[PDB]
Write a protein that binds this ligand. Structure first.
Ligand SMILES: Nc1nc2c(ncn2[C@@H]2O[C@H](COP(=O)(O)O[C@H]3[C@@H](O)[C@H](n4ccc(=O)[nH]c4=O)O[C@@H]3CO)[C@H]3CC(O)(O)C[C@H]32)c(=O)[nH]1
Length: 397
């Protein structure tokens, strides 16, 4: 039986059912969430959670806005920080601490990100960090150390591309990959409270990617995830979410490595972009559904739930107690990549938490990155257009 069939039967027999809308489309993340819910539902007498897949994360936020418009919302949903900011304009969210959920021990990197006007409105659940995936076999073949600095990284990609006859640094031309390069060239998105997409560091980061394509060391991936394109052409490296860990492990026909990100200098790893989502609880839920949500959120933050979830997926454990749990410890003792993901989670940056950020990161900035990389648009001209389109949107609403 599929975990979802088990959940269907649990919920059919329950007196109260709290809907949880999510953007996991399959693989380990969907299975780990479903397994967690099956175990929680077994503990409860006539009280259950029903996970409902809404497609991916942007399908989820579109369907959540339409749910408001149709007058009928789930009890819980996954949300990015910028989605929480949007739902707060409508005052749609219950303060988490009012519900009774204890948040002491939640990483302050994650807890700070869910706190708005001093109030926590999300529970960090599935938080990822960017890591360096590499081909251990291909680096060994050419005597190339794992690069520790941006300078070393560019040098390695050129040395390995020339030897193997193809570009070996694989990337999606998207806001997530852009953020890695932007952040570690000294970039910041807010200057004196204003959103700035066309700063010198943004032009420098996009120009670096464009030059990498022209010089033959950077390969744009335009169809599917990087881990869905492995096997065609030489691969050395990618900068990608920790949540891609199980997908790379199943796809790679080589010895997969995971390292901390190249930084400006060897004094510190590079900053990784934090992705994945928080759980939120909707005000429109009944008292009884909100009690299920409270018990569910406390279960999700328990050291065992966090240990099983993060080791099944490559998401970062969100509590200090998860790291003390023997299941976590047994996994980490067999697999150094779990400690590498935790160490990289210490060097973590977020994108702006503006209500408009979902639309800006995909339709405005994402599109300028694609114009520059796929159609050789001038990076400054592409980003100047992105700045005007973003200013017009913010001024709009
Ligand atoms: N809607 C909305 N999206 C946002 C926002 N900020 C960032 N992002 C998106 O979050 C994804 C990162 O989230 P994360 O939980 O770390 O990783 C996801 C998947 O990315 C990754 N995955 C899935 C299948 C696969 O074959 N390989 C694989 O790696 O696994 C996880 C669960 O599906 C990025 C990826 C994107 O969806 O393509 C665009 C980015 C925002 O503000 N709004």
């Amino acid at each position: 039986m599929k975990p979802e069939d088990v959940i269907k039967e649990q919920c059919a027999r329950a007196k109260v059912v709290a809907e949880l809308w999510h953007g996991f489309t399959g693989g380990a993340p969907k299975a780990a969430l479903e397994n967690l819910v099956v175990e929680f539902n077994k503990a409860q007498q006539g009280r259950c959670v029903r996970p409902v897949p809404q497609g991916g994360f942007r399908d989820l936020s579109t369907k959540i806005k339409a749910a408001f418009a149709a007058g009928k919302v789930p009890t819980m949903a996954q949300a990015f920080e910028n989605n929480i900011a949007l739902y707060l304009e409508a005052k749609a969210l219950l303060p988490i601490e009012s519900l009774g959920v204890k948040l002491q021990g939640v990483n302050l990197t994650f807890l700070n990100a869910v706190r708005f006007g001093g109030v926590v409105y999300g529970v960090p659940f599935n938080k990822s960090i960017q890591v360096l995936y590499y081909n251990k076999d291909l680096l060994k073949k050419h005597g190339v150390p794992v690069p520790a600095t941006l300078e070393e990284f560019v040098a390695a990609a050129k040395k390995l591309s020339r030897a193997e006859g193809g570009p070996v640094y694989w990337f999606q031309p998207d806001a997530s990959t852009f953020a890695y390069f932007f952040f570690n060239l000294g970039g910041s998105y807010l200057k004196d409270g204003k959103l700035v997409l066309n700063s010198k560091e943004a032009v420098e980061a996009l120009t670096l990617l464009q030059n990498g394509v022209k010089e033959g060391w950077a390969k744009p991936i335009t169809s599917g995830y990087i881990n869905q394109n492995l096997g065609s052409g030489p691969y050395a490296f990618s900068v990608d979410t920790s949540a891609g860990y199980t997908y790379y492990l199943r796809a790679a026909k080589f010895d997969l490595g995971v390292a901390t990100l190249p930084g400006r200098t060897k004094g510190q790893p590079g900053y990784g972009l934090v992705q994945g989502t928080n759980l939120v609880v909707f005000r429109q839920a009944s008292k009884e559904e909100q009690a299920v949500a409270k018990d569910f959120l406390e279960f999700v933050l328990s050291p065992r739930a966090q240990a099983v979830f993060a080791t099944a997926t490559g998401y970062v454990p969100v509590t200090e107690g998860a790291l003390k749990d023997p299941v976590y410890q047994a996994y980490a003792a067999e697999n150094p990549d779990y400690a590498t993901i935790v160490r990289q989670s210490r060097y973590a940056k977020f994108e702006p938490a503006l209500a408009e950020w979902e639309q800006i990161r995909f339709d405005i900035l994402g599109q300028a990155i694609k114009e520059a990389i796929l159609n050789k648009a001038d990076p400054k001209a592409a980003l100047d257009r992105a700045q005007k389109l973003a200013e017009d949107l913010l001024s709009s609403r």
